[PDB]
Amino acid sequence: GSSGPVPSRARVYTDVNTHRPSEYWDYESHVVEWGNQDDYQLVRKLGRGKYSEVFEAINITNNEKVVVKILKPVKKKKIKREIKILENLRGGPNIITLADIVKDPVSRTPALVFEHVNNTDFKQLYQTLTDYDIRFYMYEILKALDYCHSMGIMHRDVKPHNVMIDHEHRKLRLIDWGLAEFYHPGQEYNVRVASRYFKGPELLVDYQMYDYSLDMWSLGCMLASMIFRKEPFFHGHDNYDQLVRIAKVLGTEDLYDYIDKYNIELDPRFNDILGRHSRKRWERFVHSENQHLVSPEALDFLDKLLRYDHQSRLTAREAMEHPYFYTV
Ligand SMILES: Nc1cc(Br)cnc1N
């Protein structure tokens, strides 16, 4: 056996970028126009990322609250990609609105201006959600994902911190498109994306020909953590250990079937840590503290998202048609 990995392509929206003019997806050729940041007054720091600083601000022209993301310009091509994707998706359902692109006159630092969302941190909100609330918000994220997938884009960083929820107004926004990328059938992508707990098995086994289905694995991780009140659901201490946490639930038999279907070469680092694990029933995770959030429908939907085989997972459109969402 010396044939290399078996190629794969998305089951939906496969050729959406192929049939569009290069302007749409060639972000390296996109010309960015930077406005004057003097129209925005910074109020408070909301967070600090690896390559950004996020601030709550006021637009002085209309006295409205906005969010200003000041980017550390470490990679210009990466800045061009995020802007192009945000402009392509601008106005889509539950997608954060890019309101402006500006630079401070003195620093010349690239900054993105977004609509403000009055978010409740997940570490305080998720404990208060009812069975209905989880169904409702999951449907809202699905509307965002089916939209961006239809637009030939994969988010590649779906996690609670990238889902802003204004619970009082039942408004949800999918944010931080900095890791997002255009889907091109047959393209080999960098596997060093998403946050450890939400990384799909495809990333962990170094299978580069992934697609939109990566976002469906991440969504499943969020769902499992919400219905079982276990944060994170798969608690790896590193990227290799992350796959072992997954294998302790999904079992090692189905993992070997996955890597055999795509002729994947498993890294030798997995040899002494993987072990042998039985497939666990989803009902094993039900306890007194979470049983009011779990149902046969919830478990059937979860089982259809958390599969090693990226091709076998529900697409966002199939997911929207699941019985779990008949009440929304
Ligand atoms: N933290 C935050 C980011 C964005 Br973008 C919009 N609203 C927020 N609350």
Side-chain angles (χ1 to χ4, degrees), residues 246-272:
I246 293 167
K248 283 180 176 248
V249 180
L250 292 194
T252 47
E253 280 194 352
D254 295 356
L255 170 58
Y256 282 106
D257 267 356
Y258 178 52
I259 74 110
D260 289 335
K261 177 176 171 175
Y262 298 93
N263 195 230
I264 295 160
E265 190 183 350
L266 200 73
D267 194 288
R269 271 271 284 259
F270 290 111
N271 297 175
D272 319 322

PDB file of all heavy atoms in Angstrom, residues 246-272:
ATOM      1  N   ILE A 246     -12.085  11.643  22.242  1.00  0.00           N
ATOM      2  CA  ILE A 246     -13.139  11.350  21.255  1.00  0.00           C
ATOM      3  C   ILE A 246     -13.297   9.814  21.178  1.00  0.00           C
ATOM      4  O   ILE A 246     -14.435   9.313  21.230  1.00  0.00           O
ATOM      5  CB  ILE A 246     -12.809  12.008  19.852  1.00  0.00           C
ATOM      6  CG1 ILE A 246     -12.864  13.573  19.941  1.00  0.00           C
ATOM      7  CG2 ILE A 246     -13.785  11.479  18.752  1.00  0.00           C
ATOM      8  CD1 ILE A 246     -12.262  14.319  18.716  1.00  0.00           C
ATOM      9  N   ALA A 247     -12.164   9.085  21.063  1.00  0.00           N
ATOM     10  CA  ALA A 247     -12.201   7.608  20.957  1.00  0.00           C
ATOM     11  C   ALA A 247     -12.749   6.940  22.210  1.00  0.00           C
ATOM     12  O   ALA A 247     -13.348   5.896  22.108  1.00  0.00           O
ATOM     13  CB  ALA A 247     -10.842   7.038  20.573  1.00  0.00           C
ATOM     14  N   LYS A 248     -12.644   7.591  23.392  1.00  0.00           N
ATOM     15  CA  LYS A 248     -13.208   7.017  24.630  1.00  0.00           C
ATOM     16  C   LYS A 248     -14.741   7.040  24.605  1.00  0.00           C
ATOM     17  O   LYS A 248     -15.370   6.334  25.391  1.00  0.00           O
ATOM     18  CB  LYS A 248     -12.675   7.764  25.873  1.00  0.00           C
ATOM     19  CG  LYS A 248     -11.256   7.367  26.236  1.00  0.00           C
ATOM     20  CD  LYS A 248     -10.761   8.113  27.448  1.00  0.00           C
ATOM     21  CE  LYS A 248      -9.380   7.611  27.819  1.00  0.00           C
ATOM     22  NZ  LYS A 248      -9.396   6.866  29.105  1.00  0.00           N
ATOM     23  N   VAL A 249     -15.336   7.844  23.708  1.00  0.00           N
ATOM     24  CA  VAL A 249     -16.796   7.909  23.531  1.00  0.00           C
ATOM     25  C   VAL A 249     -17.234   7.152  22.276  1.00  0.00           C
ATOM     26  O   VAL A 249     -18.127   6.321  22.345  1.00  0.00           O
ATOM     27  CB  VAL A 249     -17.298   9.380  23.498  1.00  0.00           C
ATOM     28  CG1 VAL A 249     -18.844   9.438  23.298  1.00  0.00           C
ATOM     29  CG2 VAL A 249     -16.893  10.103  24.787  1.00  0.00           C
ATOM     30  N   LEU A 250     -16.702   7.533  21.124  1.00  0.00           N
ATOM     31  CA  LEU A 250     -17.121   6.935  19.829  1.00  0.00           C
ATOM     32  C   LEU A 250     -16.540   5.524  19.584  1.00  0.00           C
ATOM     33  O   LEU A 250     -16.954   4.864  18.633  1.00  0.00           O
ATOM     34  CB  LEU A 250     -16.708   7.883  18.672  1.00  0.00           C
ATOM     35  CG  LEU A 250     -17.398   9.256  18.528  1.00  0.00           C
ATOM     36  CD1 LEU A 250     -17.098   9.867  17.173  1.00  0.00           C
ATOM     37  CD2 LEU A 250     -18.851   9.165  18.750  1.00  0.00           C
ATOM     38  N   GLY A 251     -15.580   5.114  20.412  1.00  0.00           N
ATOM     39  CA  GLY A 251     -14.894   3.835  20.252  1.00  0.00           C
ATOM     40  C   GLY A 251     -13.789   3.828  19.186  1.00  0.00           C
ATOM     41  O   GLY A 251     -13.780   4.642  18.249  1.00  0.00           O
ATOM     42  N   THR A 252     -12.860   2.872  19.318  1.00  0.00           N
ATOM     43  CA  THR A 252     -11.723   2.734  18.404  1.00  0.00           C
ATOM     44  C   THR A 252     -12.059   1.934  17.134  1.00  0.00           C
ATOM     45  O   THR A 252     -11.357   2.090  16.133  1.00  0.00           O
ATOM     46  CB  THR A 252     -10.485   2.150  19.157  1.00  0.00           C
ATOM     47  OG1 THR A 252     -10.868   1.020  19.950  1.00  0.00           O
ATOM     48  CG2 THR A 252      -9.798   3.182  20.031  1.00  0.00           C
ATOM     49  N   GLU A 253     -13.110   1.087  17.155  1.00  0.00           N
ATOM     50  CA  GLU A 253     -13.485   0.300  15.959  1.00  0.00           C
ATOM     51  C   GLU A 253     -13.871   1.221  14.787  1.00  0.00           C
ATOM     52  O   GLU A 253     -13.298   1.117  13.708  1.00  0.00           O
ATOM     53  CB  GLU A 253     -14.622  -0.690  16.271  1.00  0.00           C
ATOM     54  CG  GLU A 253     -14.164  -1.957  16.972  1.00  0.00           C
ATOM     55  CD  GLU A 253     -15.157  -3.113  17.009  1.00  0.00           C
ATOM     56  OE1 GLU A 253     -16.327  -2.924  16.605  1.00  0.00           O
ATOM     57  OE2 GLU A 253     -14.753  -4.221  17.436  1.00  0.00           O
ATOM     58  N   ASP A 254     -14.777   2.188  15.035  1.00  0.00           N
ATOM     59  CA  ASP A 254     -15.225   3.153  14.033  1.00  0.00           C
ATOM     60  C   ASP A 254     -14.117   4.130  13.616  1.00  0.00           C
ATOM     61  O   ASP A 254     -14.145   4.641  12.512  1.00  0.00           O
ATOM     62  CB  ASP A 254     -16.498   3.883  14.495  1.00  0.00           C
ATOM     63  CG  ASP A 254     -17.730   2.996  14.648  1.00  0.00           C
ATOM     64  OD1 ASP A 254     -17.647   1.787  14.315  1.00  0.00           O
ATOM     65  OD2 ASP A 254     -18.771   3.505  15.092  1.00  0.00           O
ATOM     66  N   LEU A 255     -13.121   4.349  14.477  1.00  0.00           N
ATOM     67  CA  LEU A 255     -12.001   5.216  14.108  1.00  0.00           C
ATOM     68  C   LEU A 255     -11.152   4.508  13.036  1.00  0.00           C
ATOM     69  O   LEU A 255     -10.781   5.135  12.053  1.00  0.00           O
ATOM     70  CB  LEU A 255     -11.157   5.599  15.348  1.00  0.00           C
ATOM     71  CG  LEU A 255      -9.787   6.335  15.131  1.00  0.00           C
ATOM     72  CD1 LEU A 255      -9.968   7.690  14.338  1.00  0.00           C
ATOM     73  CD2 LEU A 255      -9.123   6.646  16.486  1.00  0.00           C
ATOM     74  N   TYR A 256     -10.843   3.220  13.230  1.00  0.00           N
ATOM     75  CA  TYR A 256     -10.057   2.467  12.253  1.00  0.00           C
ATOM     76  C   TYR A 256     -10.802   2.338  10.922  1.00  0.00           C
ATOM     77  O   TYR A 256     -10.173   2.481   9.881  1.00  0.00           O
ATOM     78  CB  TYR A 256      -9.558   1.122  12.831  1.00  0.00           C
ATOM     79  CG  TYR A 256      -8.361   1.301  13.748  1.00  0.00           C
ATOM     80  CD1 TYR A 256      -8.489   1.179  15.120  1.00  0.00           C
ATOM     81  CD2 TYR A 256      -7.101   1.617  13.238  1.00  0.00           C
ATOM     82  CE1 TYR A 256      -7.399   1.375  15.974  1.00  0.00           C
ATOM     83  CE2 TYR A 256      -6.008   1.832  14.080  1.00  0.00           C
ATOM     84  CZ  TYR A 256      -6.159   1.690  15.448  1.00  0.00           C
ATOM     85  OH  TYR A 256      -5.095   1.910  16.286  1.00  0.00           O
ATOM     86  N   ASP A 257     -12.163   2.212  10.947  1.00  0.00           N
ATOM     87  CA  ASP A 257     -12.977   2.194   9.728  1.00  0.00           C
ATOM     88  C   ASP A 257     -12.810   3.507   8.944  1.00  0.00           C
ATOM     89  O   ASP A 257     -12.674   3.489   7.713  1.00  0.00           O
ATOM     90  CB  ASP A 257     -14.460   1.984  10.080  1.00  0.00           C
ATOM     91  CG  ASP A 257     -14.923   0.547  10.071  1.00  0.00           C
ATOM     92  OD1 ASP A 257     -14.104  -0.347   9.713  1.00  0.00           O
ATOM     93  OD2 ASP A 257     -16.088   0.301  10.447  1.00  0.00           O
ATOM     94  N   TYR A 258     -12.825   4.656   9.671  1.00  0.00           N
ATOM     95  CA  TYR A 258     -12.647   5.995   9.094  1.00  0.00           C
ATOM     96  C   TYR A 258     -11.292   6.153   8.406  1.00  0.00           C
ATOM     97  O   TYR A 258     -11.225   6.556   7.244  1.00  0.00           O
ATOM     98  CB  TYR A 258     -12.763   7.075  10.227  1.00  0.00           C
ATOM     99  CG  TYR A 258     -12.549   8.505   9.773  1.00  0.00           C
ATOM    100  CD1 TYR A 258     -13.256   9.030   8.688  1.00  0.00           C
ATOM    101  CD2 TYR A 258     -11.664   9.350  10.451  1.00  0.00           C
ATOM    102  CE1 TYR A 258     -13.071  10.357   8.276  1.00  0.00           C
ATOM    103  CE2 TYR A 258     -11.489  10.682  10.061  1.00  0.00           C
ATOM    104  CZ  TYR A 258     -12.203  11.182   8.981  1.00  0.00           C
ATOM    105  OH  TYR A 258     -12.080  12.506   8.640  1.00  0.00           O
ATOM    106  N   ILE A 259     -10.213   5.869   9.125  1.00  0.00           N
ATOM    107  CA  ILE A 259      -8.881   6.035   8.548  1.00  0.00           C
ATOM    108  C   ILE A 259      -8.658   5.020   7.397  1.00  0.00           C
ATOM    109  O   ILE A 259      -7.943   5.351   6.469  1.00  0.00           O
ATOM    110  CB  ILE A 259      -7.723   6.070   9.573  1.00  0.00           C
ATOM    111  CG1 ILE A 259      -7.430   4.707  10.153  1.00  0.00           C
ATOM    112  CG2 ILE A 259      -7.903   7.133  10.692  1.00  0.00           C
ATOM    113  CD1 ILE A 259      -6.107   4.217   9.627  1.00  0.00           C
ATOM    114  N   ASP A 260      -9.326   3.829   7.433  1.00  0.00           N
ATOM    115  CA  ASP A 260      -9.231   2.871   6.320  1.00  0.00           C
ATOM    116  C   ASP A 260     -10.016   3.336   5.100  1.00  0.00           C
ATOM    117  O   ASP A 260      -9.542   3.159   3.979  1.00  0.00           O
ATOM    118  CB  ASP A 260      -9.647   1.460   6.742  1.00  0.00           C
ATOM    119  CG  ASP A 260      -8.646   0.795   7.658  1.00  0.00           C
ATOM    120  OD1 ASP A 260      -7.448   1.175   7.614  1.00  0.00           O
ATOM    121  OD2 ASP A 260      -9.049  -0.093   8.420  1.00  0.00           O
ATOM    122  N   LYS A 261     -11.204   3.936   5.303  1.00  0.00           N
ATOM    123  CA  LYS A 261     -11.987   4.472   4.186  1.00  0.00           C
ATOM    124  C   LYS A 261     -11.189   5.548   3.408  1.00  0.00           C
ATOM    125  O   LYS A 261     -11.236   5.558   2.175  1.00  0.00           O
ATOM    126  CB  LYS A 261     -13.351   5.001   4.646  1.00  0.00           C
ATOM    127  CG  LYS A 261     -14.186   5.647   3.545  1.00  0.00           C
ATOM    128  CD  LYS A 261     -15.557   6.076   4.028  1.00  0.00           C
ATOM    129  CE  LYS A 261     -16.274   6.910   2.982  1.00  0.00           C
ATOM    130  NZ  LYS A 261     -17.653   7.221   3.409  1.00  0.00           N
ATOM    131  N   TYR A 262     -10.401   6.397   4.112  1.00  0.00           N
ATOM    132  CA  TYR A 262      -9.664   7.460   3.421  1.00  0.00           C
ATOM    133  C   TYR A 262      -8.189   7.175   3.267  1.00  0.00           C
ATOM    134  O   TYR A 262      -7.428   8.067   2.890  1.00  0.00           O
ATOM    135  CB  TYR A 262      -9.923   8.827   4.086  1.00  0.00           C
ATOM    136  CG  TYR A 262     -11.388   9.198   4.018  1.00  0.00           C
ATOM    137  CD1 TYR A 262     -12.254   8.890   5.063  1.00  0.00           C
ATOM    138  CD2 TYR A 262     -11.912   9.848   2.904  1.00  0.00           C
ATOM    139  CE1 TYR A 262     -13.611   9.200   4.991  1.00  0.00           C
ATOM    140  CE2 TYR A 262     -13.269  10.158   2.820  1.00  0.00           C
ATOM    141  CZ  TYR A 262     -14.112   9.827   3.865  1.00  0.00           C
ATOM    142  OH  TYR A 262     -15.441  10.127   3.810  1.00  0.00           O
ATOM    143  N   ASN A 263      -7.774   5.946   3.572  1.00  0.00           N
ATOM    144  CA  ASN A 263      -6.371   5.502   3.511  1.00  0.00           C
ATOM    145  C   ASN A 263      -5.442   6.498   4.221  1.00  0.00           C
ATOM    146  O   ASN A 263      -4.463   6.982   3.643  1.00  0.00           O
ATOM    147  CB  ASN A 263      -5.949   5.235   2.040  1.00  0.00           C
ATOM    148  CG  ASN A 263      -4.659   4.442   1.903  1.00  0.00           C
ATOM    149  OD1 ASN A 263      -3.737   4.818   1.168  1.00  0.00           O
ATOM    150  ND2 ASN A 263      -4.545   3.350   2.633  1.00  0.00           N
ATOM    151  N   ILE A 264      -5.828   6.891   5.452  1.00  0.00           N
ATOM    152  CA  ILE A 264      -5.067   7.863   6.257  1.00  0.00           C
ATOM    153  C   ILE A 264      -3.938   7.156   6.987  1.00  0.00           C
ATOM    154  O   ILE A 264      -4.155   6.077   7.524  1.00  0.00           O
ATOM    155  CB  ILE A 264      -6.044   8.591   7.268  1.00  0.00           C
ATOM    156  CG1 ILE A 264      -7.087   9.428   6.521  1.00  0.00           C
ATOM    157  CG2 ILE A 264      -5.271   9.463   8.289  1.00  0.00           C
ATOM    158  CD1 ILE A 264      -8.385   9.795   7.360  1.00  0.00           C
ATOM    159  N   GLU A 265      -2.759   7.784   7.076  1.00  0.00           N
ATOM    160  CA  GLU A 265      -1.664   7.197   7.850  1.00  0.00           C
ATOM    161  C   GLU A 265      -1.709   7.841   9.256  1.00  0.00           C
ATOM    162  O   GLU A 265      -1.499   9.044   9.377  1.00  0.00           O
ATOM    163  CB  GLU A 265      -0.301   7.444   7.172  1.00  0.00           C
ATOM    164  CG  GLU A 265       0.836   6.662   7.807  1.00  0.00           C
ATOM    165  CD  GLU A 265       2.241   6.884   7.273  1.00  0.00           C
ATOM    166  OE1 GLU A 265       2.403   7.547   6.221  1.00  0.00           O
ATOM    167  OE2 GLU A 265       3.188   6.384   7.922  1.00  0.00           O
ATOM    168  N   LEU A 266      -2.045   7.050  10.285  1.00  0.00           N
ATOM    169  CA  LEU A 266      -2.138   7.547  11.649  1.00  0.00           C
ATOM    170  C   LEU A 266      -0.748   7.808  12.188  1.00  0.00           C
ATOM    171  O   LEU A 266       0.146   6.963  12.057  1.00  0.00           O
ATOM    172  CB  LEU A 266      -2.906   6.572  12.539  1.00  0.00           C
ATOM    173  CG  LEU A 266      -3.470   7.159  13.805  1.00  0.00           C
ATOM    174  CD1 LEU A 266      -4.693   8.084  13.549  1.00  0.00           C
ATOM    175  CD2 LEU A 266      -3.809   6.075  14.747  1.00  0.00           C
ATOM    176  N   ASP A 267      -0.562   8.996  12.750  1.00  0.00           N
ATOM    177  CA  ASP A 267       0.721   9.451  13.279  1.00  0.00           C
ATOM    178  C   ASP A 267       1.251   8.460  14.331  1.00  0.00           C
ATOM    179  O   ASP A 267       0.457   7.992  15.153  1.00  0.00           O
ATOM    180  CB  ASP A 267       0.564  10.851  13.893  1.00  0.00           C
ATOM    181  CG  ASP A 267       1.859  11.559  14.181  1.00  0.00           C
ATOM    182  OD1 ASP A 267       2.556  11.155  15.133  1.00  0.00           O
ATOM    183  OD2 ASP A 267       2.130  12.573  13.520  1.00  0.00           O
ATOM    184  N   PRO A 268       2.579   8.141  14.337  1.00  0.00           N
ATOM    185  CA  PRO A 268       3.118   7.212  15.356  1.00  0.00           C
ATOM    186  C   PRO A 268       2.936   7.677  16.813  1.00  0.00           C
ATOM    187  O   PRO A 268       3.026   6.867  17.710  1.00  0.00           O
ATOM    188  CB  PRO A 268       4.608   7.103  14.988  1.00  0.00           C
ATOM    189  CG  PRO A 268       4.665   7.505  13.534  1.00  0.00           C
ATOM    190  CD  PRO A 268       3.641   8.578  13.405  1.00  0.00           C
ATOM    191  N   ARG A 269       2.677   8.969  17.046  1.00  0.00           N
ATOM    192  CA  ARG A 269       2.411   9.491  18.396  1.00  0.00           C
ATOM    193  C   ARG A 269       1.138   8.882  18.998  1.00  0.00           C
ATOM    194  O   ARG A 269       1.005   8.848  20.226  1.00  0.00           O
ATOM    195  CB  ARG A 269       2.317  11.028  18.393  1.00  0.00           C
ATOM    196  CG  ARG A 269       3.659  11.745  18.611  1.00  0.00           C
ATOM    197  CD  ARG A 269       3.981  11.986  20.089  1.00  0.00           C
ATOM    198  NE  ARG A 269       3.208  13.095  20.661  1.00  0.00           N
ATOM    199  CZ  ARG A 269       3.684  14.322  20.866  1.00  0.00           C
ATOM    200  NH1 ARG A 269       4.943  14.614  20.559  1.00  0.00           N
ATOM    201  NH2 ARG A 269       2.909  15.261  21.391  1.00  0.00           N
ATOM    202  N   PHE A 270       0.211   8.374  18.156  1.00  0.00           N
ATOM    203  CA  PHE A 270      -1.019   7.757  18.671  1.00  0.00           C
ATOM    204  C   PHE A 270      -0.825   6.317  19.172  1.00  0.00           C
ATOM    205  O   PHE A 270      -1.638   5.835  19.972  1.00  0.00           O
ATOM    206  CB  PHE A 270      -2.143   7.814  17.624  1.00  0.00           C
ATOM    207  CG  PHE A 270      -2.679   9.202  17.374  1.00  0.00           C
ATOM    208  CD1 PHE A 270      -2.450   9.845  16.163  1.00  0.00           C
ATOM    209  CD2 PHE A 270      -3.449   9.852  18.336  1.00  0.00           C
ATOM    210  CE1 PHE A 270      -2.986  11.116  15.911  1.00  0.00           C
ATOM    211  CE2 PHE A 270      -3.973  11.127  18.090  1.00  0.00           C
ATOM    212  CZ  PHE A 270      -3.739  11.752  16.884  1.00  0.00           C
ATOM    213  N   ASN A 271       0.289   5.660  18.768  1.00  0.00           N
ATOM    214  CA  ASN A 271       0.588   4.252  19.069  1.00  0.00           C
ATOM    215  C   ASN A 271       0.433   3.837  20.533  1.00  0.00           C
ATOM    216  O   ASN A 271      -0.225   2.834  20.782  1.00  0.00           O
ATOM    217  CB  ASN A 271       1.992   3.832  18.559  1.00  0.00           C
ATOM    218  CG  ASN A 271       2.219   3.892  17.055  1.00  0.00           C
ATOM    219  OD1 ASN A 271       3.334   3.660  16.579  1.00  0.00           O
ATOM    220  ND2 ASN A 271       1.196   4.212  16.271  1.00  0.00           N
ATOM    221  N   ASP A 272       1.023   4.573  21.480  1.00  0.00           N
ATOM    222  CA  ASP A 272       0.965   4.217  22.893  1.00  0.00           C
ATOM    223  C   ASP A 272      -0.110   4.950  23.708  1.00  0.00           C
ATOM    224  O   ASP A 272      -0.204   4.693  24.905  1.00  0.00           O
ATOM    225  CB  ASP A 272       2.346   4.377  23.568  1.00  0.00           C
ATOM    226  CG  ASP A 272       3.544   3.895  22.754  1.00  0.00           C
ATOM    227  OD1 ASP A 272       3.422   2.839  22.052  1.00  0.00           O
ATOM    228  OD2 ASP A 272       4.592   4.567  22.801  1.00  0.00           O
TER     229      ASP A 272
END
